[PDB]
Amino acid sequence: KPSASNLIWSDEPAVVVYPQEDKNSEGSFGKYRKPASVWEAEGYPIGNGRVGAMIFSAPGRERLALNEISLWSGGANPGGGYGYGPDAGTNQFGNYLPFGDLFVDFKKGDQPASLSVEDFTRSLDLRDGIHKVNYKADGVTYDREAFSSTPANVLVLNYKASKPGQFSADFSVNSQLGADISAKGSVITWKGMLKNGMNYEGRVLIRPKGGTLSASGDKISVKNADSCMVVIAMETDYLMDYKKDWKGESPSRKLDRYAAKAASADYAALKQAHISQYKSMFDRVKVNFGKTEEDVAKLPTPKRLEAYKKNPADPDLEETMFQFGRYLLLSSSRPGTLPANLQGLWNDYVKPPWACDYHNNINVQMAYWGAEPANLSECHEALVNYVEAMAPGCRDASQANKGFNTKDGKPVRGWTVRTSQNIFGGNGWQWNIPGAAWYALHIWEHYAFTGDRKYLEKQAYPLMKEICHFWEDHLKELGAGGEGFKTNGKDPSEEEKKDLADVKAGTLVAPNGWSPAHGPREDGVMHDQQLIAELFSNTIKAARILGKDAAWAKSLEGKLKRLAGNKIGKEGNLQEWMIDRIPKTDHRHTSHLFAVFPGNQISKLKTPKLAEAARLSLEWRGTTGDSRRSWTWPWRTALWARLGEGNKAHEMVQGLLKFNTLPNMLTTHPPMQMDGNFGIVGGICEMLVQSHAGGLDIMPSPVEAWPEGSVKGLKARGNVTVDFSWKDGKVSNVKLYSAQPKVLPVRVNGKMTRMKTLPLK
Fold first, then answer.
1. Residue 185: how many other CB atoms lie within 10 Å
2. How many CB atoms are located within 10 Å of the residue 235 CB?
3. DSSP letter at 404?
4. For residue 487, which of 516, 524, 531 has the smallest C-alpha distance?
5. Is-contact 672 629, C-beta < 8 A?
6. Residue 509: beta bridge partners?
7. Which residue numbers delimit the Glycosyl hydrolase family 95 catalytic domain (predicted)?
8. Is 434 exposed, middle or buried (0-12, 13-18, 19+ CB in 10 A)?
9. Sign of the alpha-carbon dihedral angle for 28, 31, 35, 38
10. Strand 730-738 and strand 758-759: pairing?
11. Residue 561: which residues within 8 A CB-CB, separation 6 or more?
12. Dihedral angle, C-alpha 42, 48, 50, 53, nearest 10 °
C-alpha cells in the first residue's frame, strides 16, 4: 500500500519531450500541445539548494531537466529595462536559464526498450527526498532512484534490475543554449559562455557495474550491465560579489575538485549521506491533520487531486501539500547560495514567464513565508545575503533617479528596488518604492525567530537603518487638514478634502504612492504607510536591543508617531487610501491588509476595532475570476487565520488545491509559479501557531476540517519550538522548547496563561 501522506506518485508514465518543440513526434507529446505544458505538470523536482532537476520517468525514456541556480543571462541593466532572453547581455535584465537535459534512452539489446510495461510507478518520496521508479518487464523488476545530495553537491542516479546484466541505456545531453557537448571515456561534458560573459560547465559521469561502456559521438552507451550509477555535476563562474564583477573561479576548475570523487563513491554511501542530511531539515516539523479514507488515500496523486476537486475532504493530502512546500524551499534555498526565484530553482524555459526572476512585489517574500515558522531558518539566510549583495546595485539605480532626490536637490540616501531583480544587482521595470521596506521585514523576522544578536548587529541592523534612511529623505510632510495632499498629481476635491479634515500638521505620508493593482497615484496609500511603520518600529526595536544610535532612534520614534495611520471607513471596512473610497470588492489584491499579514500591526488582541474592519474588507472579497491565483490563496489563508477564522482560512487551502494546483502538486498561476507552494506553508502555520501579537496563540480558532490532529516542531518568535495536539474543540499536550529557560504568555483554549519552556533536544 502507498503512503497516505508525504508521497507524490503516479501510475502513469511521465510524458517525455525535448524542450525544443520541433524535436518531438506528435505521439511523444501525450495529451499536451506545448513542451512547456509538459514540463510544468509532469516533472517531479529534486534539488539541494544549488543544483536540481525536473524528472520525467517513462519505461522507454527518461528526461532530467537540469538546473543550476546561478545560470543567468543579463547584467547590471543600467537602463532599468525588462529585456531578457538567452542572449541578453550585460546591458539587459536577463533571466534564469535551463542548464541542460539528460536524456536516458533505455534499450533491450541493440533495439529500443518497450514503452509499456507492467506495474509502473514513479514517485517523489518526501520522507527521504528521493525520486523512485519501479516496474516489471519480461519477469525482470527494474528500479530507478534519483536525488540531489547536499554533502556530495551533485545529482545521483542509480538504475538496478532484479536479474544480472539486464540494464542497457544510451545517455545523451541536450542543450537549449548551443552548448559544446562532447563525450569522451565515461563522462559527457557540456559547457559554454553566455552572451553576458558567464561561463558554465556540466559533467555527466557514468559508473556502471558490469557490461560494456562506449562513447560514440556525443552519447554514452551502456550494454548488459548489472546496475548503473550516474553523477551529474553543474557549475558556473558566478560569485555573489559586486566588487568582483560577479565573477569567481572558473566552473571547470571547480568541477575538477569533487565531480570525479563523487562518481568514485559507492552509491549506498552517497544515498546514506543524503538521507541523513535531508532528514535533518525535513523531520524538524511533523504534522497530522487527520485520517483520509483508505479508498481515497490509495489513489495516485493526479487522481487524488481530481477526487479532491469533487470532495475536498483529504487531510492527508493537505499534509502532503504543506510538507511539499517545505521540501521545495529546502531544495532551492541554502545559506551560501542564491534565493529561490519564481520557480524555486527549476526552469526549462529559455525565455521564462516574468523572467523566472526575483519579484519583490510579493513573490520573493512569499517564497520565504514558511522559512521561519516551519523550522527552515537557514533557508532564510539566502534571501538576506542576497538582498545585502544586491544592495550596491540598488543604490546605483536609486541615486540615479532624480525622482528620489531630496528637497535640497541631493540624491536620496539608502536605496529601494524596482519590481524585478536579477543576480547582478540589476533592477527591472517599474519602481517598487516600498519594496526595500518589505525586505526589511524579512531581515527583522529572521532575528525575531532566532534571537541571533550577531546576525542583528553585523548584517540586519545596518541594512534596516539604511532602508530607514531612504524613507527619512522620501517622506512628505502634510499641513493641517492635509494641506499639501496630492492625488494623481492634482489637489483634492471638496469631497476628498473632507476625509483629510482630521489630518494633523506634520503628518508624514509616502508621496505619490500606489495601492497594488489599482487606484490613483496618491499620497499616504495605506499599503505604504503600513510598510514604513513596520520598518521604523522594527528598526527602533533593533537599536534598543543593540544599545545603538539612541539619539537617532529617538528621532525615528518621533517620525513613526507622525506617520498617517489606519482608518475605518464609513462602511466599516478598513480603508485602503486616505480617501474613504468605496471598497474594491471585485479586486484580487488586499494590499491595505498588509498590516494583518505579513505585517504585524493589526491583530484581534491588540487592535480589535481595526481587526474587525480588516475582517469586513476580506469578507467582501470574492474567490472567483482573477482571484484564483497561485498567490491569492496563501495570502488569504494567513489573513483569515490571523483574524481568528480558521474555517475561512481552510477554505483558502481548499481553493489552492482545487483551482491552482497541477497534477504534480506544483502550484500554477497559470503558468507554474512556486509562490503558492511556498506561501501555503506560512498560511497553514498561522492557522496552528501565532507569535506576533505579544505572545503565543496556540490554534487561535478551530478548523472544522481538522477535528483531531497534532503538530511538532513549529517555530515561534523568541526562538521557541512548539509541539501540541488537539481533539474535539480543545488543545492538549502543549510543549514549548528553547535553548534557554523562558516564561511566555500563552493563549490556548480561550484562556491566557504563562508557560515555561523545556530544554531543546
1. 11
2. 30
3. G
4. 524
5. no
6. 476
7. 267-688
8. buried
9. negative
10. parallel
11. none
12. -20
Q: Is 185 left (phi over 0), alpha (psi -120 to 50) or beta?
A: left
Beta bridge partners of 135: 142
Report helix, strand or coil for 269.
Answer: helix
51-57 and 44-47 beta bridge pairing: antiparallel
Which method resolved this structure? X-ray
195: Cβ contacts below 8 Å, ≥ 6 apart: 73, 86, 87, 88, 89
Specified resolution (Å)? 2.0
Q: Greatest CA separation found in the chain?
A: 88
Q: Which CATH class is domain 7-80+96-284?
A: mainly beta
Return the closest-CA partner of residue 418 out of 72, 76, 673, 70. 76
Alpha carbons within 13 angstroms on the beta-carbon side of residue 139 total 2
Mode of pairing for the β-strands spanning 696-698 and 743-748: parallel
Q: How far, in Å, CA of 535 to CA of 436, rounded?
A: 9
Cell 555573489: give the residue. 240
What does the DSSP assignment read for 483-518?
TT--BTTB---HHHHHHTTTPPTTEEE-TTB--TTS
Q: Torsion-angle region of residue 453: left (phi > 0), alpha (psi -120 to 50) or beta? A: alpha
Task: Please give the Cα distance from 368 to 333 (Å, whole number).
Answer: 9
Angle at alpha carbon of residue 96, lines to 95 and 97, rounded to 5°: 110
Angle between helices 435-450 and 526-546 (to 10 degrees): 40
| Cell numbers found for residue 383 | 534571501
Residue owning grid cell 503628518: 507
Domain boundaries, the chain: 7-80+96-284
Q: In this structure, is the dihedral angle defined by the CA atoms of residues 258, 263, 269 and 273, taken in order, positive or negative?
A: positive
Residue listed under C-alpha cell 543550476: 68
> In angstroms, rounded to a whole number, what is the distance separating the alpha carbons of residues 346 and 96?
9
